[PDB]
Amino acid sequence: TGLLDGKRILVSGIITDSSIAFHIARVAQEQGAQLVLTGFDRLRLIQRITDRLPAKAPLLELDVQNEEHLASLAGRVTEAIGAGNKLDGVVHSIGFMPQTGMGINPFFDAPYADVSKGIHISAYSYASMAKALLPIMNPGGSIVGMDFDPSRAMPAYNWMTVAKSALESVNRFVAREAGKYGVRSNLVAAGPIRTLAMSAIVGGALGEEAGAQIQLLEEGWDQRAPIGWNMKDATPVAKTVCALLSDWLPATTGDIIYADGGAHTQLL
Amino acid sequence: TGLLDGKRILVSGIITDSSIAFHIARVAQEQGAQLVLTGFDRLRLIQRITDRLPAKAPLLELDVQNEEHLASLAGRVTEAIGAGNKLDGVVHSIGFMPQTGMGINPFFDAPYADVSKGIHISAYSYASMAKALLPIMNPGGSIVGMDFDPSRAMPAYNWMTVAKSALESVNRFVAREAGKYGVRSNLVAAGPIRTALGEEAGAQIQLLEEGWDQRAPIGWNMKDATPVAKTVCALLSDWLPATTGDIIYADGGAHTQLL
Amino acid sequence: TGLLDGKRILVSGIITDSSIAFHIARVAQEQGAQLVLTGFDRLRLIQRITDRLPAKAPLLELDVQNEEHLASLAGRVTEAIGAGNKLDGVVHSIGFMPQTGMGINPFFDAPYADVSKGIHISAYSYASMAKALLPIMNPGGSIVGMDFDPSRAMPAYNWMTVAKSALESVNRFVAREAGKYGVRSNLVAAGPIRTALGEEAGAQIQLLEEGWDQRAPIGWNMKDATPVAKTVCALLSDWLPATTGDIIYADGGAHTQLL
Amino acid sequence: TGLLDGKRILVSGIITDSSIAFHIARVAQEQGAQLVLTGFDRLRLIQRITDRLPAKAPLLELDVQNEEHLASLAGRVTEAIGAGNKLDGVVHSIGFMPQTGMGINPFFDAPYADVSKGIHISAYSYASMAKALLPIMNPGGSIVGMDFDPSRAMPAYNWMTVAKSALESVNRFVAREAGKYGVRSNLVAAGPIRTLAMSAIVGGALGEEAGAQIQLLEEGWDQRAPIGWNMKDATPVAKTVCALLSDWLPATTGDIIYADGGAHTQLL
Ligand SMILES: NC(=O)c1ccc[n+]([C@@H]2O[C@H](COP(=O)([O-])OP(=O)(O)OC[C@H]3O[C@@H](n4cnc5c(N)ncnc54)[C@H](O)[C@@H]3O)[C@@H](O)[C@H]2O)c1
Ligand SMILES: NC(=O)c1ccc[n+]([C@@H]2O[C@H](COP(=O)([O-])OP(=O)(O)OC[C@H]3O[C@@H](n4cnc5c(N)ncnc54)[C@H](O)[C@@H]3O)[C@@H](O)[C@H]2O)c1
Ligand SMILES: NC(=O)c1ccc[n+]([C@@H]2O[C@H](COP(=O)([O-])OP(=O)(O)OC[C@H]3O[C@@H](n4cnc5c(N)ncnc54)[C@H](O)[C@@H]3O)[C@@H](O)[C@H]2O)c1
Ligand SMILES: NC(=O)c1ccc[n+]([C@@H]2O[C@H](COP(=O)([O-])OP(=O)(O)OC[C@H]3O[C@@H](n4cnc5c(N)ncnc54)[C@H](O)[C@@H]3O)[C@@H](O)[C@H]2O)c1
Ligand SMILES: CCCCCc1ccc(Oc2ccccc2)c(O)c1
Ligand SMILES: CCCCCc1ccc(Oc2ccccc2)c(O)c1
Ligand SMILES: CCCCCc1ccc(Oc2ccccc2)c(O)c1
Ligand SMILES: CCCCCc1ccc(Oc2ccccc2)c(O)c1
Would you say which domain of life the source belongs to (chains A, D)? Predict the structure, then answer.
């Protein structure tokens, strides 16, 4: 049978077929998980994408900034999975940061309203999503978010890095809350994955300064990674998340698991 | 002679005489530094307090949330220290967080507008302050801010801990920008210092504070901010010229010990 | 089907039925793995114990200090699993340290020959074991060893903590060598598990152990090694194919919490 | 006056004029510190070198493996500084590792007797040196050793990296011991410094594989370092040690201070 048999897992974050949450959903379903998906803006668009999944699953609207979406989320899920049923897994795979705070723009030229908006979506929403769903979660359940190692600074990532340093702090705190329900909360720190913005800067959407930079950071990842790293394959990352959602890591919470090919453990 | 002779150092954060920034200023002055102090809201009040310092130094108004204070900050400092003169050191010792996101309030009940306000004052202001002053800073200068180890979660500190996780990340980036000026940028992670909440808090804080002194191999006195103020001066000095984007712990070593 | 179906996994470290390696083997077998077990000194004794496992598996002699056991290890495994067959997983669950360098003895009174013996068995043997078996391992295989967070110092554990700081460093290097074979290499940092020393120890261990369960957001039961044995199996499986040279914590989250 | 006025500091580790301990001594003396030096093998040779210091200081023999040198060390120092006088600072700047465990040799081909010998000298000796001198140290005193960030693996450094991971663990423990005497114990994690072996592999003492590698790791250090890093200047490292020996860091022990130009805090 499948890694996640008879587990009901909410997976947010799907926008395209290159999304990390798309492959987290695909694998979860491949491992026999009943899913519940959420989407942010282009619900019609994500309907077309989510239809390309192994199995049919309810799709709810969730704008983590929206105070109404959050207040109503549990009940909507209750309706979708069926009264008397609970969640065994929540996948937070949400991120955002205006151009001002990430990319070619000077680190010091990001206005706070932009940084604030990105932290809200990339860091605080993890707590508010756990606050909504914790109540309708089963003991032994698992909440996992996506992270990008922010231990050290780097070019381009700038204020996103500061948002991810927030998310890791938030995660350890959400573990406190989540423990009172016997639920774990961890983050999967993945190496770079080609999606849209990052698989666009290739040719040079950001210019010759950028491109040739990210193309360097990415490149070095595959060298540093003792088992290597293919930025065009989001499957290994997705499987790590499934391992976190499963029951084979029942004593690990408030933590961070690194799906980056070991790159973060090697200097050169 | 003093550790910081001839150094023009801007020091923010004083509000009372218990303020970590008060002792930083007091020690920097004792070590022969020319200070420029900034205050946030109660300028008259902090005038009373800053008058209790070893030496007289210009007091400017700075509210890190105010876009006008920031844009003008450099020019006003230039006028206080004199045209042609530049700063050798900047002390960010600013911290805030509404009760909603820190204390007895449940962690999940902090509304973002609050959390966001606290991160703006506690984390982002470090970058915006650096962005303002970096241009009027001398090579080999030092920017140092205050921190409280947010590596692990804990009761009460809650969202402040999240704001500090942000500062440390901001600091590594400010080190990048500051490098372009030959300027370092580090954080000093101090143990708790004394500067109502009920029986849970008076139990927790006095239990967390207590265990600090136990864990600390040299011990920890929460009623003395001097050890911390000296660590900030060592950072402002020239005896740590190769360290930037880093964090120096003035905590009695508590953070290196488990029990 | 099981997590580790069709996987040939070598598991060392069993000595009693409380041994973390016993439950690792028990769980790997419950998840349909073909095991090859190794034992150190009391082979007859561990035969009695290994007979208490779900399934029957070959038991080889391995004393990581013995240069002959190491050189022959591959060939003997080849013969047990069959020529042409290779290993998919190696479990290093070996640990030692004389009383001199761990327990009530003062930290400064541990003679090197002792400390060196403990590091040889507890740290270096991880590399020498990897060097022996890596050649008879399949791509996508997994080497996992046991660890106890040595980030911070603590009473009693003393030089074992130093030996574990070494293992973690050894592990990052074994990840390099192992990568050349498409093999991962990680450590599982478990909370204390039950497997005389006087009133100080019975006070400390029961105080350190106790506070573990408090710190742990999901709690921690030192009388149950199963959660730990499952984490080792998740590492041996294929649901963590992108993680190597790393450390997975099976400790109830205790290490992410301060108080 | 000087940073270390009227402080009596033992400084070991001087073998040549490029030694990190040579500059730690030179600066300490420049800051008005009474020194006590120790040497390992070529005492005659180090006599010639130590004579090139700002000021005259007693030179004792200390082979950290030798059980006799350790047992007699305090008394010899007592004699050199004068009965009734104590040390205010100890500088551990000792390292060793046979070619087998560091360089071009395969990581797996280092025999334990070699690794053991290097850990003994590079890690355990820090404890045994503190065990000898702690008794003749003043409250407020400072014990500092030299370290090289071993968080992540790297080429060439191999078993030395494993020795430094040991030393950092040892350091936190020595802090326990050292606290009972009101003495601090920290490590200075420096970036690479041209000495003898490392300033030899330049041309290619280790070959074209090496050289072009270390020359890469070194190079990248100066790029990653936001204030940059000059591998030909050991002065900034020495001054950090003096800051640790001084009284301007009285609340930091069992810790590690990084003198590497910030390189360890930057990814690219
Ligand atoms: N792609 C990578 O290289 C990689 C690596 C490390 C971490 N991550 C993290 O994984 C997560 C998703 O990454 P991805 O690469 O799949 O990105 P993506 O661009 O494919 O998806 C980002 C998601 O955020 C959603 N979103 C934005 N604002 C929202 C809001 N207001 N309310 C609800 N949803 C909102 C978008 O709809 C989108 O699905 C992010 O946290 C990202 O930082 C990605
Ligand atoms: N007190 C402790 O136990 C301790 C321990 C570790 C770190 N710190 C840090 O040191 C710093 C100062 O701490 P403190 O204990 O002296 O606290 P304090 O309350 O005495 O100082 C905090 C300062 O923040 C200033 N401030 C608030 N909003 C501002 C704004 N909008 N613009 C400019 N200034 C503003 C206040 O005027 C005040 O001077 C903080 O960052 C804090 O996190 C304190
Ligand atoms: N027990 C705990 O609380 C706990 C917690 C964290 C980590 N660990 C780690 O797990 C591993 C095993 O722990 P355990 O509690 O099962 O202890 P155990 O005493 O049951 O197992 C230790 C094993 O080391 C073996 N061993 C000793 N010398 C050997 C040698 N020369 N060659 C081959 N094998 C040798 C012994 O035979 C024994 O099986 C150790 O590395 C230990 O550090 C244990
Ligand atoms: N040089 C660097 O790039 C750098 C960077 C980081 C850390 N460090 C550390 O600084 C320390 C010294 O480095 P260095 O570059 O000055 O090296 P060096 O080669 O100049 O000196 C190493 C010292 O070890 C001494 N020594 C060796 N065995 C001894 C023993 N048996 N008993 C007593 N003394 C013994 C030698 O006599 C020598 O002085 C080492 O710990 C080293 O790892 C150096
Ligand atoms: C730009 C630097 C390369 C880092 C890799 C990377 C790529 C995408 C990332 O995720 C984002 C998704 C939406 C908004 C912001 C970020 C990220 O986490 C990490
Ligand atoms: C109640 C929290 C216990 C931790 C000790 C502590 C106390 C005060 C702290 O500083 C603050 C000052 C103003 C606003 C926010 C934070 C802190 O850093 C650390
Ligand atoms: C007494 C130490 C408290 C820590 C808990 C603990 C207990 C046993 C441990 O494992 C050992 C087994 C054999 C030899 C050395 C170590 C350990 O890892 C961790
Ligand atoms: C070889 C890789 C470059 C690392 C920089 C470096 C250079 C010298 C180092 O110190 C040594 C001194 C004596 C014996 C062994 C090591 C080191 O610590 C760190």
Answer: Bacteria
